[model samples]
Target: ARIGFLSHADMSIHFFRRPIMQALKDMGHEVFAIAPKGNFTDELAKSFHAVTYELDKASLNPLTVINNSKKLSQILGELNLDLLQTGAHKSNVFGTFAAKNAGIKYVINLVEGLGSFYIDDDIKTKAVRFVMESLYKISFAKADACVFVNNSDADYMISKNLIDKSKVYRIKSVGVDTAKFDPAITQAVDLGEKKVILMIAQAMWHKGVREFYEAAEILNGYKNCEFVFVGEGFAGNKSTADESFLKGGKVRYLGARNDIPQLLKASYLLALPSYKEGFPRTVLEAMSMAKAVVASDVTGCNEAVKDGYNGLLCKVKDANDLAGKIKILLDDEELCARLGANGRSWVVSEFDEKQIAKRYIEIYRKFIDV
Candidate 1:
């Protein structure tokens, strides 16, 4: 089968979906990737052994869409994609529209997160949300099937009565590389810090960085503890009005680091204060490193860090509660050890990457006979 994947950006697709694409290839499927021409997306498409389509990287205006759509329309004739899967909302629109026009047999919509369209307060956000909704309704209303990363998302869509219940499917996650992320045989890493707390994710307002900053402020009084915020983003993009709070000595923003697994191994615990999620990959990665987790009680985040079992859970958007949870794990070495062990065991049992990838294949096959 010839498979086509389209998304807004490269990181948006590659972070979680790469394994699935690779797995599809190993299963003898022809895979193609479409996105705005960017360094990251081009590199990732090459890595997954998928033919990359470099659409003009620009705003999704009508002209931009028309030009890109024309290019896509031209390519569909040659690629003869059996299945078209889209991740980001715009890609879902343009790609699905093009696929339908091209007479593709199966089309699947992959909703990674709700995005600002579902929950944004500002005027610009509201406008963008309206446009995205309009496009999605018109473009993907006839999609063969839809997939979400967690049950919470599926349940939410079901409750909204957006699509037919039978057409909606819940995927455990984008699927992790268990062997690559597991703690079973990972060698110990040394970061030369007494204790490290990791907050790794693309800086987005809903990602829960404010709560993390507040938690760090509270934990700052302690000696030999460092809170590292990984990844790069303007503090204003998906962040608070004031990033000055993180100014002084307690927080160390490491921008973006390539060696995340090594960092998690050296860290004492992983912390996430995200307000929204669609099964965050960070939590799973942390557990795979055999580290305790501290996360706000959101759907996908909570699923990974099961309160006292694998890690600790605090109220969503509550910085004080997050701080208290961190204090508990930091002060009680035994509890941390136990929780970390439990987290590792849970990951090995439930979120094993290869098994999860197999589940994706089952879903894809339902729509595509091959």
Candidate 2:
């Protein structure tokens, strides 16, 4: 069988969908990666054992969208893909229509989250949401299956009538490589008896970067703690904290990094105060490394951090509440260790890569005879 996976960002495929793609290849299928060419495209091609296809970078203009769709339709017609898997909003919306136009069957639409347009309350955001929802409804209705990373997102799409309830299937975090992200791989970084609170996320406002900064400000008197952020703002994403904040000592921004596993082992705790998410792979990676997490009590993060069980949960977008939770872990080393240990055990048991890959294989088999 010939399968094609579509996403807007090449890194989304490199990081999240690698396991699934490998599983498909192991099943003896020819797999292709379809996305805009970017820094991770070559790496994705090599790592996933896939032939790469490039989609044009999307723009707001209708002509650009039409050109992208026509080119995608032509590619799909050439490859004659047996199955089409799409992730992110633009790919799901545009790729689904393209697949349909190309006469492709067995389309799988993966919804990570609704994105900022759904969460923001401005008139412009609301109007964009209305348009996107309408597009999703049309695309989803044409898809063979609609997969969501969490139940809340599935519920949201269903309630909004963007997808048929029957097409919904919920999968957890894209799955983490336990062996690679293992805590035992490296010795913890010597913090000189100081606690380290790490936030590993893109520098976006909706990702709670600002809230994390404000929380750091609130903890100014805590002389023995360090707040480090590990991501930089990217093109087309304008909701980032001020450049001045990343420059000073209030929060140490390491920018984007490639050594998250090693960094996870060194950090004492992880914090992600995002307002919304699909299923943040970073939290799972932290859990896989046996690092306690302090995340917002929103849909996706809440599903991963079970209050006092594995980690602490803070109110969404509340810097003060975020600070309070971080302070608890900072002051209680024993509690942090316990939660970290429990989190590692839970993630290894419940969100293992092999199990997730197998589930995807099973889903693919249902759609393909091979």
Candidate 3:
């Protein structure tokens, strides 16, 4: 089967779902990709046997959408693709249109999460959500099937009446490569004597960095506790955010780092107090690393953590409650070890990549007349 993955930008695909396509290739299927031409996308194509094409990233403009849609149709017409899979909102919009026109046998829409859906509204954010909601309803109507990383995501979309109940498949957030993310195998990063309280996210507003900062203030006098953030956000994100809490050498923003598994291993715990999520990969990776998790008791997070069992869950966006949970784990080494071990067991059993890849293949084969 010929499968083409539509991507908006190089970095988006590489940092996100390259592993899924890699799994497809490992299973002896052909892989193809379309993205804005860049070093990141180029590297993915070279490494993964993906047939790469350049698609314009600035597709919100109607004229650009039409021109890109024309090219998308021509390219898929030549490739005779059996399946077209797309993610990110813009790619989903354009690719859904193009895939329908190209008569691809099956199209899959992966809802990584709804962006900016739960943020406090300003005039700009309200207008943005309106457009996004419209786009979701239209794009979802065209998809043969859709996948969400967590039930909360599915529930949210279904509540909005954006997805067909039968077509929605709930899966774990991206499956971590056990070999690469194993607790037993990662090398420790140097952080000296300070105990690292960490978060890994794309630095978006809902990522709860602000809440972490508030919690940090409450725990400012705690012994050896320091906050570190890893992963890239949009440019100017750090500047736009509240960074006053970083003043006392108490917080370190590491931006984006490739050495995630190792970093998670060295950290004492992972905290993500986001208001919303699909299924966050950071918590799963932390769990796989046998590290305790402190996450908000929101949709996607609840799936990864069971309260007082595998990990602790704080109220959504509540800094005092968040700080309390962080302190709970920080002060009790035995509880941390116990909870971390439980989390590791859950990840290995539920989110194995090979098993997930097989499940997806099974879905695809169902619609194809073998």
Candidate 4:
């Protein structure tokens, strides 16, 4: 089978879907990855077939999307892929139409998360939601199957009649590379009598960057604790952590890092206060590193944290609630250790990348006879 994956960025494909690509190749299926040119494209080209196709990653212009879809269809027609898998919102929406136009027999759309567009309540947001829901209804209805990383997303799609219930499948995560993220492999950073509360996400408002900053401010009395944000902002995002915020009293921003494993090992706890997620890969990575987590009690975060067992959960969008949770972990070292140990064990038993790759193979086989 000639399987092809379409995603918004090359880095996303490199990090989350590469293992599945390798797995498919090992199973005798030729794999191709299509995305806009990015830093990871060369890395992807080393093992699996890689193709660069430009598409408006963040644009909502109907004409732009329609034109992009036509371009993608032309590419797919040339490749004549046997199986097509589309991931992320842009890929899922545009790639679905493209796959149909290309006459691909098997198409799988991956719903990472409904995103803030589905949760926000402004008039503009409402308008965007209307467009997205209508587009999804048409596109998803045509897909052979839709893979969701979290059940809430799948259930919402079904409830809204955007997709057929029978066509939905759930996967725990994209998968974490346990070996690379293992706590035993890296030396934890010595905070020198201070505790680290790390948040690994982009500096976007929906990712809870503002909430994290507010929480840090509320924890000003905790002289022994430090708050760190470790990600960069993308273009066109509504909100971002400004330079002033990054250099604030209690918080420090370590913009976009490659040494995530080491950073996770050093941190006493991981906090993600995002309003929405499709299964945060960073939380799984933190769990793999045997670090406790404090995440917003939302759909994907709830699925990962397990509340009191592996990590603590706080009310979404509530800075004070987020602060309270962080204070609990900082004040109780024994509880942190216990939760950290349990988190690593749970992730090892359930979410290893190799295991996830195998599961994808099982799913793929269902659609592709091979």
Candidate 5:
């Protein structure tokens, strides 16, 4: 089969979807990649059978959108792919439409989440949400399959009648690479003698930046531990955290970072207090590195961190509960080790990239010939 993977940004595919694309290639499929020109575009070009670019993800102009859709259709028509799997918002909405225009045999639109717009209920947001849902309805119908990372997202779509239940698939994630994130490579960087509690996420309000900071305040005098934050702040987003809020709290903010695995290594556990997630790769990476997690009891977080088994779940937006959960692992070394060990095995068996790619292959085989 000549399969193609499409995403709005090169970094999204390069960071997460490479394994699945490579897995198809290893099984003798001619795999291709598509994304707009970005830092990782050329890197994907080197790896895939081909890489097509020039789709702008940020543009809201209808003229540019229509033009891009036509261009995308031409690209798909030339590729003549048997299957096309698309990720990210713009790709999922427009890519499938282009695939339909190109008369592609099979289409799979991967829904990570409904996007940040769905988090609010203002008039303008409601208007945009209505439009986005209508587009999703059309795209979901055009595509042969819809792969949702979490059951909640799938259920929401089904309940809204935006997608057919029969066409829905529940693939937890693209999955983390356990080999590179192996527990054996512990602490490549020194983060001091204090046991570190790391929170890695974009500095977005909806991502629970406020909750994490509040939790840090609650955990302030816990003596033997430190709360460190990684990742950068978004500039223009309305929900982006203020620099003072991001840098003010008891949490030691490290701004943006490149050394994620090393940061995971130096940490005792990872904390993600996001109000929502499609399926956070941070939780997967931390678990794969044999570190326990403390995530909010939201859809994606709950699916990844099975409370008391791999890690504990705190109530969403409850900084006190978040602090309590973090303290449980901090105060007890034995529990942390037990949970961390369980986390690694669970991630290896369930959320490994190879395993996820296999699931995707099965889904492809299940629907490709139909």
Candidate 6:
């Protein structure tokens, strides 16, 4: 089988989809990495059958997208892929269009998230939503199937009649590499004696950073706890939370760090008080490292954390609920230990990268199985 994984950036396709791509290659498939040319293209080429670029990642002009789709279709036509999978809104729509034109045998459109576009309802946002939904209707109708990482987004689109309920499938995550994110990974970050409540996410307003900050304040009197989040402040992103808010009060901002396993190993608990999610990989990473999670009881979070099972669930946007959940973990260290061990087991059994790769095989092969 000849397969291709498409995305907006080489880095995302390189990092997030690498496991599934490698899985296909190991099974005798000729796997290709498709995204705009960038630093990661060489990295991808090291393992993939090939790497190719067909469009600029950031442009939204209709002419730009349509022209690139035509160019990409020519490339796809030459490859004549057995299966093509794509993520991100632009990639899902345009990639499907190109695959249809190329007459690809199987096309999977991945909606990683509905994203901030769905969160914001301003006039500009409303206008974009109208256009985006309409494009998705056409693209989805042409694609073999549409995969969603969370339940809410899939249900939302189905209820809105943007896609057929029959075409939808929910994957817990793209997948997490359990071998790399070992709990045995030694911690280099020395966070004094205080128990760390870590939140690793892009500093976005919808991530519930404000709620996290407030929770920290509620627990501020406790001398043995520290709240920290990781991100390099992103400017010009409409959904981005500025440094003024991120740097103030009870939370400590650790500007982007590469040692994720090391950091998670040092944490007592991983907290993500998000309003919504596309099955947070941060939570998955933490779970892989044997850390219990505390996340909002929202769509993406609830599906991953299983409430009293792998981790605790808190109410969305409720700082006090978050603080109280943190208190439960802090007060009962044994419970934390229990939940953390369960979390690791959860990932190993259900969410390991190889397990997810097998699921993808099930999806693609089912198309040909009949």
In angstroms, give how far residue 300 of model 4 lies from its true place. Answer: 0.9
Model 5, CA-based lDDT: 0.85
Tell me the tens digit of each residue's lDDT in model 3 across 91-151.
Answer: 7777788878888868888877666545557886687677777877887888878877777
Top candidate, metric TM-score: 4
Which has the greatest lDDT? 4
Query: What would the TM-scores of all predictions be?
Result: 0.87, 0.93, 0.87, 0.94, 0.90, 0.87
Q: Rank the candidates by lDDT, best first.
A: 4, 5, 6, 2, 3, 1
Model 4 per-residue lDDT at 331: 85
Candidate 6: 10-residue stretch with minimal lDDT: 49-58
lDDT of each residue in 1-370, candidate 1, tens digit only: 8887777677765666667777888887787766556557657756553445647544657787787777776676467888888885666677788778888878888877776456557888788766766676666476888788888877776675566678787877676566787555665456565688888876666777777777788888464777888876655443442334444436777766777777888789999888877777888888778889998887678776788898998898798998898888878989998988887787778877777778777888787765
* Candidate 2 lDDT over residue span 76-141, tens digit each: 778889899999888898889999999898889898877887678999878888888889888988
Worst lDDT window (10 residues) for model 5? 49-58
Provide the global lDDT of candidate 3 against the true structure: 0.76
Can you write out model 6's per-residue Cα lDDT over 345-370, one digit (the tens) per residue?
Answer: 98888888888878877888877541
Candidate 6 wrongly placed segments (more than 4 Å)? 37-39, 49-60, 68-71, 74-80, 185-188, 242-249, 367-370
RMSD of each: 3.1, 2.1, 3.1, 1.8, 2.6, 2.9
Cα error of candidate 5 at position 178, Å: 1.9
In angstroms, give how far residue 97 of model 3 lies from its true place.
Answer: 0.6
lDDT by residue (tens digit), candidate 5, 1-370: 8888888877778878899888877777788878777767777778886576676676777899889999999988899888999996788888888888998878898988776677777998898778878998999988888889888889998999999998999998779989889868555568788889899987888788888888888889485788898977766667788667778888888987878889998899999998788888999999988899999998788888899998999998798999998898888989998988999998888888988988888889886641
Count of residue pairs whose backbone atoms collide, per candidate: 2, 1, 0, 0, 0, 0
